[PDB]
């Protein structure tokens, strides 16, 4: 386990990579459920870098219909919704350390538009240490991003039966390499992956959750296959046994056709993230960045796409990483059988 | 997540539904393992309603042979057993907010017999907020109870193979609608369901735990079927694969034939409870009232029944909700394929 | 003693008097030394009034040369000095509940000038309850302020030998009635008094600390007389025995001729404040608002006057209430032998 | 659950069995993640027995590459590595209560070599109460030990297809019966089992994890079989469906052939431990001594063996108990179909 | 006030003055009453300097007959008396940060004889910051010590009537400059003063506590004079008004003639310490190192001298600083009218 002293040293490293120095102001955003050891380490480390530091504490926002403790489960209103003063309190900072998980939401976008940069840090200290961000991780993700920006389409195949086509061009490519060095940029310690969105009403085919694939926020390894049939950018069919029935029930609960929309699509570039990691944890340990970032995954998501100017505001959000996939940009392979093959400068 | 201010507001709402005002005294019952946020919310809410409040703290009571942290798992002695002074300090109050989970017991029965009412509140704040009680839930539950009170039998059928018959008449109906408004009432925030017990030595047939059905306190979704054979009110056969072997091994550990007795039988009337909720939580988050109360479930239980004056006092306790069942009172359906059909006022 | 539930109810009362409702944003300002019970009561009461609430936490600022724990002791820089982001986080709010004691500083002044109002709340809960603010206190203090705003001079006599003259006109009158209802305005729960500053270089004569008079932050009842001789707005002589020597030593330690300047002058209008209260407390309990506000005192201060555009930024600050005084505005008595006599509408 | 009073009485019972009295010194070793109720009960109980007591707190040692919170998962350096002062602070004591889980290490070995005794106590109080140690447990385990010490081979068979042979003689028998009564003794409250190591490069055959068998630290009941092929003391094949792929991916993570080595092999003598217990718990509750200790299990381990002077110091460590096994010492059965049959004096 | 981050930085500064680096082990010694913020800052500062750090927690030791919370008040047994294992756990370390205050004792003497050095840090963080140690303070104190080691007598006069003679030679000089850089060194953050002991049975004359002089641990400014008559090293007369009566009654309570023995004698070299500071604090804020160390004081003490091998073991312990004194070493003034004059290097 990580000592307090070590956790402060980790935050000094990551805040330095985030370009925090005596010219910079740092806001540590927190709520009653934020990890106090992480809040303290962030506040202390920023002071040690001679930054101007303050904490902003928001009362927790409850979604009555939300189930489970995972903050990614319910993307609706947040503690900032209608709270312009608190938003201005974050906009005043050069860098916000988010320890409460501001959903990508309209208010977070305006903060980023002022040139404030935002670093999410919510995973437990031991997970923060295993995937301590590096400039080399930035280099590899940005190399990958060069290909993604150039792509007119993304295609996924797998032996299990994935056969999925996403026309690209309408939406930007987004990177997460673990540190918030650029003004107006959001990132997540820990991370190391990239994604875009398909063009409106355009994603088509089949995505198969094989045995051993993951649904977040369920934080289960599939023991039975689930087939997702996609037409015009929407899931139209969810087929399998029990796990398929559980997924259909959960998605129906929200009573909104928007939950079936395909949102972000991309691949994982983090070799310190591990597909096996989730099964050594309890659900409430964190949001499982290991499952989202692991090297060579294909990661897709469902529901809201508001954050890049899409139509869909729906709260129901799933992140689904698939293993063993072939991933093409315009029929050049970036991943084959779950190993990163291109570009050469993105490989571990 | 639920803020401290919102949790106090929720306790104000539920204590009002529970008829707490400045004439009433409230005892907040806790042990070392009680959620301090919930305790503080109940104490503050009661003071704001100008009630006469105090907290009662008991040393935790340990069952040395009990496995796991779920306090429904081992039904024996409580912190109240042989503690008459502690029992009288709770009897003094109009309303007890139980944050430590006093199991049903002759001591809790005696508290309720003084007219004191008891509200259990142990689930996490977020769950308490999702199933915040309503007068509407009490009306629907009492509409169901009217039908159950007059029933002479209960019958369960499922496509998976359930075919279960329980003659009624010997035992009363119990409601749980989330609040403790009546003197001598016990209730549980959250809830929204009702049950009774089968006549002695009478329950008969097959109950199939299908893929997806749940055992409490294991808190797992069955990935294989378990077939229960029941004769004269007792499970005489448990068949299937691994889940069946696990359940057999767990029930044998108590070395007590009373573990196999069918206790309460009922259905769920809580639409804000969800069959899917359990899979989003860790085991220690709570006792999973979602699984017990979700709308259209059939809920049966095993082990002790001395809370209704039955013969069995065994500590081994299971709660097993089944989905997609047909539930009949005397050949009138109250649930079909897991949807509540009757009475209309309960839907 | 005061329960948590009662402390929250007191904050609902005071924030309502302070015009907090669903149209308003409230920042609760704190540091590590703030009372957590008061912070929580403020945060919760604001939430109950449906205000948009957030807390702002600043790292404690230390004055190495400062002695004792009394924040009023050392009026130098604060946690806001060169922390413009933190200052903007406070300016964002309609009302700041100050639980860390932002001295009267160029920064507080700037926040007030944006329209933000500020309520200081640092005394212990039992003291907050004894002097829970009323609209009637506001009425009495504003009735007194009418006469002060009409005055061209202030004069103090006492049997012990006070004979003190202060020309007025250059500086404004300031009230503290316990709540922050008016935009751009600072107040302190608890209070109930008013003051102004003498014209530059003009205050003259003698102020005598009699047996039983008080020096803050020493928090002592004088057991020997101290005579202060004042010329052209400055103490030129401090005479007596031991208490006089202690005071000379304390003031000399600051090595700054500015500490001897007379700052604010006024009288006490709080009958719920008591001259005897300090003797029932330890020093660290609070800053002793009873000694500042008690009905019919004459209160004068030394040192900094930067807060109203005076020349003196000096950190050494004393507050000295005198009992049994005759206090005049021009030829009119407002207090005689320590009883408030005018105006009639200011009396208890 | 277990009250603070009952926890103190339990620690008095176990410290008495551990020969703590007024002649003895007890050190309670802790880190930031230690259960404070257990530390307090150990300190209080040692003082009730009139022993001299002190607590030693070490900073947490982190393994950056370790996954999950289970400290048995990663055998490397510890907080004692390069920390002779802390080692000597524990050597000063007659008995160390370890509430932080000092892994078997050269430094711990040096503590025991001085004569100091070590009791590990990290499982939750309720688990500590259910397997509260008895003199009778020690008797039964030592009776098993007298057979194990002279055995020349150990053999395992099951219906599921285990057929495993381990030549013995190179390595000692180790017992755990729940208390530290003898000088230089290490034991773990709770326990009740025993094991050896196979001769170097000698273990041969097949171990089948049947449906229901367990891997620690994964804390899963297998839902399909895993077949392990062992040649010359190493796993050379891992076969099944999902569990097998997950196990293979976990083990290859460490990029070290030592991970596949068979370490300790033994059987369980704790009837108060239960194979069903793990399924009622969350992963972070404890290390699941129930799974290691249950009466009639076969427990084998993988990875490091330097604790007995073997060659392997690899951090990757698995404990794997099997049910329903026949266990032979030479051609004398000690367990048949997961039931303990010999010695007679070892049975429950 | 001092932030957590600044308090760690202060410990970094003082541990570096104390020669803590990657090579050194640090034991942070605490009990239940130790300031957790100061303990945490010492642990974090030591880890940041890459020292091998551990904390040692001892059960508190109580003197049933001691009055007040000041631990200088009652010199006897400590948490280390009869706890050899705890003593060895501290001897294992290069440096001990004492946050619980071990009184001088045969056990602490034994720790220092191993080469272990000990830094006392128990005053509040704001006091630690006002008197943050400097090498300049060490140089000035050591300049004074050079002169003291050569002195054959110490003499005090004051206009208030002090006329006190102490022959020297028998006992060493002790410095406190705020940091534990040398092995076997004990020191105290904060400090900045030095003292010795009078030859056995030799101290003679009068010490007058003027109006404004202080008794520790009473922590009062005298409002009336107290005259101490001293013969052959012992207070024989205590005269004055109410402070004298209180002092007589306090010293009689110990029922022990050793309480009247004169122990250490010395002068203050800390200008950042202030005679006025005590009057701004509550008694429980700390020991009042300000009163002990302020520049140009004369500091004498009563009771035990066992720590330099004197005969007196008595627990009753007073520290009394006098203002405006003339202090002479054999004819050379080191202080005149409370101003440090010699050596020039010490000013
Ligand atoms: Fe997503
Ligand atoms: Fe039940
Ligand atoms: Fe003032
Ligand atoms: Fe092992
Ligand atoms: Fe002394």
From Swiss-Prot, chains B, E:
- GO function terms (MF aspect): 2,5-dihydroxypyridine 5,6-dioxygenase activity; metal ion binding
Signal peptide coordinates:
none
Which reactions are catalysed by this chain?
Answer: 2,5-dihydroxypyridine + O2 = N-formylmaleamate + H(+)
The reply on keyword Iron is yes
Which keywords does this Swiss-Prot/TrEMBL entry list? Aromatic hydrocarbons catabolism, Iron, Metal-binding, Oxidoreductase
Per its UniProt entry, what is the enzyme's top EC class, as one word? oxidoreductase
Q: Which branch of life, at top level?
A: Bacteria
Q: Which cofactor does it need?
A: Fe(2+)
EC number(s) stated in the UniProt entry for this protein: 1.13.11.9
Q: Which residues bind Fe cation?
A: 264, 317, 319
Observed phenotype of the null mutant: Cells lack 2,5-dihydroxypyridine 5,6-dioxygenase activity.
Biological pathway: Cofactor degradation; nicotinate degradation
Example GO BP: nicotinate catabolic process
InterPro entries listed in its UniProt record: M29_Exopeptidase
PANTHER family linked: AMINOPEPTIDASE, BLL6088 PROTEIN
Q: What does this protein do?
A: Catalyzes the dioxygenolytic ring cleavage of 2,5-dihydroxypyridine between carbons 5 and 6 generating N-formylmaleamate in the aerobic nicotinate degradation pathway.
The protein's name is 2,5-dihydroxypyridine 5,6-dioxygenase
> Upper taxonomic classification of the species?
Bacteria, Pseudomonadati, Pseudomonadota, Gammaproteobacteria, Pseudomonadales
The encoding gene is nicX
């Amino acid at each position: 386990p990580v000592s307090n002293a070590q956790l402060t040293q980790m935050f000094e490293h990551v805040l330095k990579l985030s370009r925090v120095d005596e010219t910079q102001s740092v806001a540590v955003l927190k709520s009653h459920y934020s990890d106090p050891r992480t809040v303290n380490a962030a506040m202390e480390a920023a002071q040690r870098l001679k930054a101007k530091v303050y904490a902003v504490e928001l009362p927790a926002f409850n979604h009555p219909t939300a189930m489970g403790n995972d903050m990614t489960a319910y993307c609706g209103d947040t503690a900032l919704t209608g709270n312009l003063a608190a938003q201005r309190a974050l906009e005043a900072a050069d860098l916000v350390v988010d320890t409460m998980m501001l959903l990508h939401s309209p208010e977070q976008e305006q903060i980023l538009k002022t040139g404030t940069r935002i670093l999410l840090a919510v995973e437990p200290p031991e997970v923060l240490a295993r995937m301590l961000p590096t400039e080399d991780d930035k280099r590899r993700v940005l190399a990958a991003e060069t290909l993604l920006k150039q792509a007119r389409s993304l295609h996924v195949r797998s032996k299990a039966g994935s056969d999925f086509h996403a026309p690209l061009g309408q939406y930007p490519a987004v990177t997460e390499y673990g540190y918030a060095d650029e003004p107006g940029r959001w990132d997540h310690w820990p991370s190391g992956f990239l994604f875009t969105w398909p063009n409106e009403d355009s994603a088509e085919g089949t995505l198969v959750l094989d045995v051993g694939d993951i649904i977040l926020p369920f934080k289960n390894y599939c023991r039975e296959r689930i087939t997702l049939e996609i037409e015009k950018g929407f899931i139209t069919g969810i087929h399998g046994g029990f796990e398929a029935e559980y997924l259909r029930d959960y998605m129906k609960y929200f009573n909104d056709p928007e939950v079936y929309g395909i949102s972000h699509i991309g691949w994982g570039l983090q070799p310190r993230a591990q597909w096996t990691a989730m099964g050594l944890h309890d659900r409430n340990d964190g949001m499982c960045m290991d499952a989202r970032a692991f090297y060579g995954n294909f990661l897709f998501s469902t529901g809201p796409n508001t954050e890049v100017g899409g139509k869909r505001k729906t709260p129901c959000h799933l992140d689904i990483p698939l293993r063993n996939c072939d991933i093409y940009l315009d029929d050049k392979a970036v991943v084959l059988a779950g190993d990163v093959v291109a570009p050469e400068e993105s490989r571990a």
